[PDB]
């Protein structure tokens, strides 16, 4: 479920705070043409939270941060979180919070109060240009499990008539004195099993059908 109300606002504020810390650190790289103390940081930001745009402004106060939304609402943000740690524990607007943080390309994945969301922080122009990008569909797998390496079947776990989720271990194929676990890349039921424990397979051979 995607967040709502104060939860979503707290998540967006934490996202902005993380982005600000990282930009500050980034701007200290060696080898620059002139001193960075003479450059400016843009105050207006767009937090995108699994398709829910928040226009915000970020301002440092004391040693902590202040994030202002369009409603005039304000949220101060304070924490001692550092990159690498898996938990952001701090204060957002007179409420202590703990949030699970994971990384992803150009942003983070955040979990809080049973809600989960991808989070990306842009400038206005970056957001305008990102809104020109399409939403692409996934093709999906092809109804059957094919052996990607030649080897010997060591163990088949699932049974016929068995619905499966992703990451489900299905079989083990040993080759060159090393086990290899095969997993489900889709969801569905096991119709029939074509391979027996102890068999020997070639590349692109069929093990089971969905």
């Amino acid at each position: 479920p995607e967040p709502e109300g104060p939860v979503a606002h707290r998540l967006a504020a934490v996202a902005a705070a993380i982005d600000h810390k990282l930009n500050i650190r980034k701007r200290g790289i060696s080898g620059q043409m002139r001193d960075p103390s003479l450059l400016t940081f843009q105050r207006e930001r767009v937090v995108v939270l699994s398709g829910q745009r928040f226009n915000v402004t970020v301002d440092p106060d004391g040693d902590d941060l202040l994030v202002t939304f369009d409603d005039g609402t304000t949220a101060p943000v304070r924490s001692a979180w550092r990159p690498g740690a898996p938990v952001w524990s701090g204060t957002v607007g007179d409420q202590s919070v703990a949030i699970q943080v994971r990384p992803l390309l150009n942003g983070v994945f955040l979990q809080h109060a049973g809600a989960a969301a991808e989070a990306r922080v842009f400038t206005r122009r970056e957001a305008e240009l990102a809104d020109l990008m399409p939403v692409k569909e996934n093709a999906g797998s092809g109804k059957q499990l094919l052996c990607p390496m030649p080897g010997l079947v060591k163990q088949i776990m699932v049974s016929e008539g068995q619905e499966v989720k992703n990451g489900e271990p299905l079989a083990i194929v040993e080759a060159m004195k090393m086990e290899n676990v095969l997993r489900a890349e889709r969801d569905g039921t096991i119709s029939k099993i074509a391979a027996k424990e102890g068999d020997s397979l070639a590349v692109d051979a069929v093990i089971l059908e969905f």
């Binding site: 060696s30 843009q42 970056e126 060159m176 004195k177």
Partner: protein, 506 residues
């Protein structure tokens, strides 16, 4: 003058409002938008906005378009100077002409002169046919300069559209090639000639798409979802790399500690020698903040290559991967790792290697394909390196593979080993079957001899007794030791013999 402002406003429209709208409808950015997203705000200085072509054949004189199909100039990325060019698909399909090529040559020469990186963005169709041989000349002059810049400044290419014909050989001589999924492709000869000559029917996606070039062909170093993601990742990559072959790696303030211990690593190697583990976990625990930029992640997955940071300085990583093909060395993996090691040595980046290797891949396919030379490539790369080299053996190291993976014998500076390391000529079974060839008639003597061979030689202590290993360390100390060694080794100075160049095998 208002009129000059109008001249500029008209140059900025390329080949028309309709063509730009069609580009947008395909889900693709324009040349100038790409330049805008790559560089720091307000830093872009453009060269040669008003350049026009001078061809008079086949009616070309009636359509002169300012810029001639490429946008060129310079700016800053995170404060550091970079040069760049971007091809405009809306002008004669981004095809290269004489003046177009002259613009590219201008920025290439300036970048070599200033000793700064150069980024090329490709969305093109090759040599403009209406101009004939002159067009080809242009390509040549670009190629030459690519070759002059190799090992002096980093050269990055981004494929965001079609790239066909002579256009493909310029990215091929650069250091890294990145692609966008579902809108880009590369090939030398296109589907029509393929149909007429080979009778095979094939789409462009099938012939030269992102999947082909990231998983099967060895050409592309990675792929991305769309243009915005890709340009943001190029910005990320530029912050790891040296500006040139003199200045050394950039430095940043790290949020991590160098004296921290990692207890979990003490349980990463399984008791059963038949069960694998994920070497990527080790790498992502050793680097600062868990941040790792992987190179050729979808190709030859039996080996891992990429960039991380230690104490805020860039470090390259090579590692065997047991999860795929039992971590063996084959031709593909060897070539992958060899190019990476050569780049890092050329630009003075230190290298850390993690070793778990049982041997090479057997079969007629490998031998007929040229494994002798392909394998020799990696050995050559390591033996030639003068940067610091730190190697850590986790579990297996047998035979020639042990020598190839940054051993002390080929020039490594420091060589550690975990307690689970097994450094030997080969496995106990085969060693016994060879040494005791005229005794295999029995079954119990066989087991006894195999057990005693295991006890004596399948360990790290013979190599330690000979000094091939500097220390056997506990796993939890890995990071702490690496960070210390690298520090000490920053002052290494060594040089190879004098020569025009080596004769590394191809």
């Amino acid at each position: 003058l208002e009129k000059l402002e109008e001249r500029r406003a008209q140059a900025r429209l390329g080949g028309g409002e309709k063509r730009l709208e069609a580009q947008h409808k395909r889900g693709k950015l324009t040349a100038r938008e790409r330049i805008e997203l790559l560089l720091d705000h307000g830093s872009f200085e453009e060269f040669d906005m008003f350049v026009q072509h001078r061809s008079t054949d086949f009616g070309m004189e009636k359509q002169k378009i300012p810029g001639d199909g490429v946008v060129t100039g310079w700016g800053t990325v995170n404060g550091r100077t970079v040069f760049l060019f971007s091809k405009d698909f809306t002008v004669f399909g981004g095809s290269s002409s004489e003046a177009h090529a002259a613009k590219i040559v201008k920025v290439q020469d300036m970048a070599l002169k200033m000793r700064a990186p150069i980024i090329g963005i490709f969305d093109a169709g090759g040599a403009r046919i209406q101009e004939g041989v002159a067009a080809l000349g242009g390509h040549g002059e670009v190629f030459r300069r690519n070759v002059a810049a190799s090992g002096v400044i980093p050269q990055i290419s981004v494929i965001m559209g079609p790239c066909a014909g002579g256009d493909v050989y310029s990215p091929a001589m650069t250091d890294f090639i990145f692609m966008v999924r579902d809108t880009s492709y590369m090939f030398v000869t296109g589907p029509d000639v393929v149909k007429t000559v080979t009778n095979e029917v094939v789409t462009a996606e099938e012939l030269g798409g992102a999947k082909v070039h990231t998983s099967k062909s060895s050409i592309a170093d990675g792929s991305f979802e769309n243009d915005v993601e890709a340009i943001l990742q190029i910005r990320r990559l530029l912050d790891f790399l040296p500006a040139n072959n003199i200045e050394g790696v950039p430095e940043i303030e790290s949020f991590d500690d160098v004296n921290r211990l990692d207890k979990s690593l003490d349980t990463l190697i399984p008791d059963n020698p038949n069960k694998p583990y994920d070497m990527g976990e080790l790498i992502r625990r050793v680097v600062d903040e868990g941040d790792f930029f992987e190179i050729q992640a979808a190709y030859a997955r039996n080996i891992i290559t990429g960039f991380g940071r230690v104490e805020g300085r860039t470090v390259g990583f090579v590692a065997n991967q047991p999860l795929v093909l039992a971590g063996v060395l084959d031709s593909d993996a060897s070539r992958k790792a060899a190019r990476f090691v050569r780049f890092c040595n050329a630009f003075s980046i230190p290298i850390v290697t993690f070793v778990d290797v049982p041997g090479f891949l057997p079969g007629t396919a490998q031998e007929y394909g040229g494994l002798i030379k392909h394998g020799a490539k990696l050995l050559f790369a390591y033996s030639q390196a003068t940067v610091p080299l730190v190697t850590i053996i986790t579990r297996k190291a047998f035979g020639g593979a042990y020598i190839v993976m940054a051993s002390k014998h080929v020039g490594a500076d420091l060589n550690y080993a975990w307690p689970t390391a097994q450094i030997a000529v080969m496995g106990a079974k085969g060693a016994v079957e060879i040494i005791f060839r005229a005794e295999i008639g029995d079954a119990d003597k066989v087991a006894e001899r195999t057990k005693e061979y295991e006890d004596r030689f399948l360990s790290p202590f013979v190599a330690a007794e000979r000094g091939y290993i500097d220390e056997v360390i506990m796993p939890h100390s890995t990071r702490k030791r690496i960070a210390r060694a690298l520090g000490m080794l920053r002052t290494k100075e060594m040089e190879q013999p004098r020569k025009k160049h080596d004769n590394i095998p191809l």
